Nucleic acid binder design. Structure first.
Ligand code: MG
Ligand code: MG
Ligand code: MG
Ligand code: MG
Ligand code: MG
Ligand code: MG
Ligand code: MG
Ligand code: MG
Ligand code: MG
Ligand code: MG
Ligand code: MG
Ligand code: MG
Ligand code: MG
Ligand code: MG
Ligand code: MG
Ligand code: MG
Lengths: 191, 107, 203, 141, 173, 244
RNA sequence: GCCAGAACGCGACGAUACUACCCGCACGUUGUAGACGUAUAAGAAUAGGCUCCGGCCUCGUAUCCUAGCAGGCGAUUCCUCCGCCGGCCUCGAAGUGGCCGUCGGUAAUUCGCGUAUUGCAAUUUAGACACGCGCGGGAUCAAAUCCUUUGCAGACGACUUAG
RNA sequence: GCAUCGGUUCUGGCGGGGGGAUAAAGGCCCAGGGAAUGUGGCUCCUCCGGGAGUGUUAUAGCCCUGGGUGUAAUACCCUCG
């Protein structure tokens, strides 16, 4: 079973610009610019209407057509991200031993780095380098919050996963020792 | 003046003998003709004459160059290779050498 | 078909075994071959399979003495291509040795072999054989993760010769301008009847 | 928010599209069976371009820019011939680059030796006046 | 192989007790009438108590398509043998002739189900007269309104004897 | 059948070819990686070994048992007479490795270096660099400054050729030893200028090395004629009642 | 990092007596896995490119060169193309090309003399790489081994030194 | 080496004949009956390309049955040169 024609459309708001060349997408708007390369997928791009982009695959199989929506949702996420940004929230959870962190400022480059001390009462100092373009803040709204913000969802989420994955308990029952840092809510910078 | 060349023959190559997979027969040889792909085009050279020219060491009768004469017998395969028959079988060291295709028996 | 004195093939974009079979046949026929840019060939399938295949090749060695008789594992892309071609030729005979003597292989474009026209064999291009969406790797990368040491020197050297060819292209574009304007200016002015005579003859 | 995309665009296979077979024949598509085979025919007064009615595989065809408008699907030979003459497909194809290049190609295989000698001498005659103009502009620079 | 439709008529040898026996007719797809008779005796041996030694052939004819230049949909009922047991199917095809449907069905079953010619029985072949009686989803898509599709990345033809082209080819024919 | 009790192998296979050095003087295989942010400096030296002796010193190792107590240690003494620079060499990178393309020498050469190029110096004519020396004072050394510009233009690493002053040691040998040390510095032009400015001048070891520095030693070990397996590899001896 | 270094893998430099070396042409005993127009330089993508910004792309079935005793002797004509040298720039992955100048040859058009007899076919003995020789010009006037000795070395050779 | 012949054999082209539903299709003409992936009209929405509904030839056309042009041509098999 080979499918003749499968098509979807993406609207574009009247605020930003997008240009595609040789399967390389450039999106630039009020909050910056992003680049992505999609040369590994055979897709045909076209301009359906004044503000609608269409893309399609011809004579594809079910497995090939399955990947068609993935680019659509990635491009939509980039469109949202370049006009509204992204924001993740994190909480610290300890029972007895407090954990203290220090998100020091730029280290002579755009990258931020986070220092974590006193995890389950350990004297190890553990060092993490954030992806470029992501801003880390200690919240002042109320206590025990870590604020992550940025332009790209992939970098914001991966950096959050780095923070989550670096605080691990070893040789203990993790159903009893619930210590660690976890993400609790994801959203946009505006509203 | 008159810097052009002097050629009135077609160049060809000596490929191999006639053989199965483990037995060879030096009686007939195989020649690759320049520019021929199918047997319809290869039909033009049936009955023509081929020559093999080589250099010797001694002076015998006004020359140091010998020739072996032969003629094309029938086509071979679908790739335009042709079979040939010589007065003497080729020296078996010329697998890859070149031969001259004349145009004497015309039409 | 045609017989040239020597032919130079640019290796970028050709499958290893399909190029090696054509080359081994031309060599046994009597042609002379020079292959250039051996670091840009391709192998079908995802990279990990090629790496596992090479590791299985690397595990072979003579037991009683590794300095003699054992399979010597060359680490260069050109030597990998040379092994592929050598496996398709009866290299243990005088005829095979003579056939192999007509072949030269290099990485990059050596100074002897630039300033020349680079040929293409259309029976081995990847873009005309493989399915879009399939996976392939690069011989240069495979040699990188097996011990090739001169990847960065050739990579840095190649942009210099590409800048020189850019300047030569600029000169060629300028040179075309006089010939193009000359044909238009000359043809109209002079010839009264050579024009339609050539047109009627197809020129 | 003007958006500019420079992506490929092929030629569509609809009804009325005329193909070009290997042996210099033109045929108009009247029905699609599969993604590999179509039903097509071309009624032409010229015996070189005419083709019978039947099925042609899509791997043996080339897509020309000419399209017959409003051709009913599954029409008979009479109706296709009527639309062929009304649209003037045969006259339209004559000025295309493919037809002129093919004709200029075919004229070359039929040349007598005396004509080869004459075309060589005329080519030299034009080249002589060509090099004078090339030298004149090159000197001016 | 290359098939064509026949009709074959058989009969039991007349005897003094039962003169003028009955006549049986079937439609058989076969490359030629020599194997058409063999298939007639093979199918008849499974339905009536008649053999070739005790039977005879009255007539064999060839059936040709009435409109071999019209596109139509077909449906096939068949029996086959698996590696354990027997099963029934129902397939559909879209083309211009009846015979090619049997050729395509033989190639399709031989590819998708590894079924040889020895173990295929044809029950009935019918042309679908309407368009709303098409069941399978791989034929409904071929009758959609304003069908059209491009042909991306189709390799051009280059002579297999002309090696060493002088420039990079293109796939935009 | 399997081995009864397990044990590691005797000796090491890393230093497997256990043969005499091809050349008498020890050979250095690698040099420290170049960094263009330090000033130009040499990175090697060469001398002769005098002997060994014993020292006594106090230890500064917090947390140890012998902290702030006297210790006795053994040391070795290396004679290091001053060196003389003779020339410089430049190398280039090729897809087959490194290779040298030019070399330049000083005007005047000592008899120590000239002794090295001959096998029977006593009955020779000592015409080593006679024709080479005359290119100086001819067009003001245009050929030399051309080759120096070539090194400034095409080279990536530069080494310097230096030799020892064997006349200042009690050794009977009279032929000196020469080798090259690469200059690691800011830029190739600075490297070549610094190397050229040191022609036929002495350099002391204190300019190269300094106190309490961690260094490397390369040499050729003491030789033994021909030994059995027991002393060569260290295998167990067979019982006393073994025949043959 | 470290160990050995292909005894048929490679580079730089020093000194080279015996025409050992270099330059010019003069023939040719002699060798070759096999000339006979041995003519063609962008890079990059293949679900896109090229450009003279007007357009162009399935196709190298292309472009350049291609006449005259194996290519003579003169004339009317024409300022094109080819070759040897000399001088300046440039080229390092295994170092190449460009410009200028002198000199020699030259159907783009049209003519005048000579070709025979090799006898109705018999390779069309013609190219470039080395190498051996003969001349006439330039430069140059060396080492190694045996031997005695040393012990940082050693079965004997070999190795580190001195004469 | 060439011309004219004999035996064996490979490989091209041309002129005819017979058979089947006296091929089946197909072109033109006559007579009858239908439908939709519904032509032209009409209605509504969308101006943003167009879409939705009604309805059997009109400013496109398609399917089924019978007859003439027919002893039509062509494909396949056989056959005389
Ligand atoms: Mg426990
Ligand atoms: Mg060995
Ligand atoms: Mg045991
Ligand atoms: Mg000892
Ligand atoms: Mg011990
Ligand atoms: Mg005993
Ligand atoms: Mg060696
Ligand atoms: Mg001599
Ligand atoms: Mg002599
Ligand atoms: Mg002149
Ligand atoms: Mg005969
Ligand atoms: Mg007939
Ligand atoms: Mg309507
Ligand atoms: Mg009818
Ligand atoms: Mg009839
Ligand atoms: Mg008839």
């Amino acid at each position: 079973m080979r499918y003749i024609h499968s098509e979807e459309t993406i609207p574009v708001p009247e605020n930003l610009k997008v240009s595609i060349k040789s399967r390389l997408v450039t999106v630039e708007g009020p909050r910056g610019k992003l680049q992505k390369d999609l040369s590994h997928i055979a897709v045909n791009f076209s301009v359906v209407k004044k503000g609608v982009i269409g893309l399609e695959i011809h004579h594809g199989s079910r497995k090939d057509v399955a990947a068609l929506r993935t680019v659509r949702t990635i491009i939509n996420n980039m469109i949202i991200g370049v006009t509204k940004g992204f924001k993740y929230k994190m909480r610290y959870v300890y029972a007895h031993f407090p954990i203290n962190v220090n998100v020091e400022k730029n280290a002579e480059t755009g990258c931020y780095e986070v220092e974590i001390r006193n995890f389950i009462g350990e004297k190890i100092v553990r060092k993490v380098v954030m992806a470029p373009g992501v801003e880390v803040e200690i919240s002042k709204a109320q206590k025990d919050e870590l604020i992550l913000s940025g332009n790209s969802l992939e970098a914001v989420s991966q950096s959050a996963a780095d923070i989550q994955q670096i605080c691990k308990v070893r040789n203990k029952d993790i159903r009893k020792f619930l210590d660690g840092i976890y993400v609790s809510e994801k959203g946009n910078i505006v509203e | 003046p008159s810097e052009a060349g002097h050629r009135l023959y077609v160049k060809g190559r000596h490929l191999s003998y006639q053989r199965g997979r483990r037995n060879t027969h030096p009686k007939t040889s195989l020649i690759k003709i320049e520019g021929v792909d199918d047997t319809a085009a290869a039909n033009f050279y049936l009955g023509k004459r081929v020559a093999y020219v080589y250099r010797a060491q001694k002076e015998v009768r006004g020359t140091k160059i010998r020739v072996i004469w032969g003629k094309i017998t029938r086509p071979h395969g679908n790739s335009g290779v042709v079979r040939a028959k010589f007065t003497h079988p080729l020296p078996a060291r010329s697998f890859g050498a070149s031969v001259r295709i004349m145009l004497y028996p015309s039409s | 078909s045609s017989f040239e004195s020597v032919v130079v093939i640019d290796g970028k974009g050709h499958l290893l075994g399909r190029l090696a079979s054509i080359v081994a046949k031309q060599l046994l026929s009597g042609q002379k071959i020079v292959v250039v840019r051996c670091e840009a060939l391709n192998i079908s399938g995802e990279f990990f399979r090629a790496k596992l295949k090479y590791h299985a090749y690397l595990r072979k060695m003579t037991r009683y003495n590794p300095t003699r008789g054992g399979p010597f594992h060359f680490r260069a892309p050109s030597r990998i291509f040379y092994k592929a071609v050598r496996g398709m030729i009866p290299h243990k005979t005088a005829r095979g040795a003579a056939a192999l003597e007509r072949l030269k292989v290099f990485e990059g474009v050596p100074p002897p072999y630039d300033k020349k026209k680079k040929m293409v064999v259309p029976q081995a291009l990847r873009v005309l054989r493989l399915q879009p969406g399939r996976k392939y790797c690069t011989v240069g990368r495979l040699s990188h993760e097996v011990g090739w040491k001169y990847q960065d020197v050739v990579a840095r050297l190649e942009e210099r010769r590409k800048a020189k060819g850019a300047a030569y292209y600029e000169r060629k574009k300028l040179a075309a301008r006089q010939l193009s304007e000359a044909k238009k200016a000359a043809a109209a002015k002079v010839d009264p009847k050579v024009s339609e005579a050539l047109a009627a003859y197809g020129y | 928010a003007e958006i500019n995309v420079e992506a490929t665009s092929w030629r569509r296979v609809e009804v009325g599209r005329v193909l070009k077979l290997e042996n210099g024949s033109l045929a108009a598509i009247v029905e699609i069976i599969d993604h590999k085979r179509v039903l097509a025919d071309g009624p032409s007064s010229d015996p070189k371009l005419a083709t019978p009615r039947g099925i042609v595989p899509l791997s043996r065809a080339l897509l020309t820019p000419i399209v017959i408008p409003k051709l009913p699907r599954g029409a008979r030979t009479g109706a296709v011939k009527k639309a062929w003459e009304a649209y003037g497909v045969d006259a339209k194809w004559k000025e295309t680059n493919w037809a002129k290049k093919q004709l200029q190609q075919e004229r070359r295989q039929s040349l007598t030796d005396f004509d080869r000698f004459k075309v060589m001498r005329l080519k030299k005659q034009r080249r002589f006046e060509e090099r004078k103009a090339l030298a004149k502009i090159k000197a001016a620079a | 192989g290359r098939l064509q439709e026949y009709q074959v008529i058989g009969r039991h040898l007349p005897t003094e007790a039962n003169p003028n026996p009955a006549l049986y007719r079937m439609r058989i797809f076969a490359p030629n009438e020599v194997v058409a008779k063999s298939r007639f005796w093979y199918f008849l041996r499974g339905l009536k108590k008649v053999k070739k030694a005790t039977g005879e052939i009255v007539s064999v004819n060839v059936i040709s398509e009435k409109h071999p230049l019209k596109v139509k949909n077909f449906g096939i009922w068949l029996r086959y043998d698996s590696r354990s047991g027997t099963h029934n199917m129902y397939k559909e095809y879209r083309e211009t002739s009846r015979v090619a449907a049997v050729e395509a069905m033989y190639a399709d079953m031989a590819a998708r189900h590894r079924a040889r010619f020895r173990s295929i029985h044809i029950l009935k072949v019918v042309e679908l007269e309407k368009t709303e009686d098409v069941k399978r989803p791989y034929i409904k898509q071929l009758v959609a309104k304003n069908l059209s599709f491009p042909l991306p990345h189709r390799v051009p033809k280059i002579s297999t004897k002309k090696i060493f082209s002088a420039k990079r080819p293109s796939t935009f024919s | 059948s399997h081995r009864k009790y397990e044990a590691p192998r005797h000796g090491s296979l890393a230093f497997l070819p256990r043969k005499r050095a091809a050349r008498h003087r020890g050979r250095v295989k690698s040099f420290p990686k170049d960094d263009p942010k330090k000033p130009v400096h040499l990175t090697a030296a060469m001398g002769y070994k005098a002997g060994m002796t014993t020292i006594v010193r106090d230890l500064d190792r917090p947390g140890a048992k012998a902290h702030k107590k006297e210790v006795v240690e053994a040391v070795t003494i290396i004679d290091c007479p001053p060196m003389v620079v003779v020339g410089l060499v430049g190398y280039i990178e090729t897809p087959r490795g490194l290779r040298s393309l030019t070399t330049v020498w000083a005007e005047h050469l000592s008899d120590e270096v000239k002794r090295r190029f001959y096998k029977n110096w006593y009955k020779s004519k000592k015409k080593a660099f006679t024709k080479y020396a005359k290119k100086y004072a001819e067009n003001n050394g245009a050929s030399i400054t051309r080759e120096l510009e070539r090194i400034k233009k095409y080279c990536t690493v530069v080494r310097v050729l230096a030799h020892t002053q064997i006349r200042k040691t009690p050794l009977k040998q009279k032929k000196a030893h020469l080798m090259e040390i690469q200059i690691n510095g800011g830029s190739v032009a600075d490297k070549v200028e610094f190397g050229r400015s040191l022609f036929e001048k002495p350099v002391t070891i204190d300019t190269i090395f300094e106190k309490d520095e961690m260094i490397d030693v390369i040499a050729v070990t003491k030789g033994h004629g021909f030994v059995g397996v027991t002393a060569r590899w260290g295998t167990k001896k067979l019982p006393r009642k073994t025949h043959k």
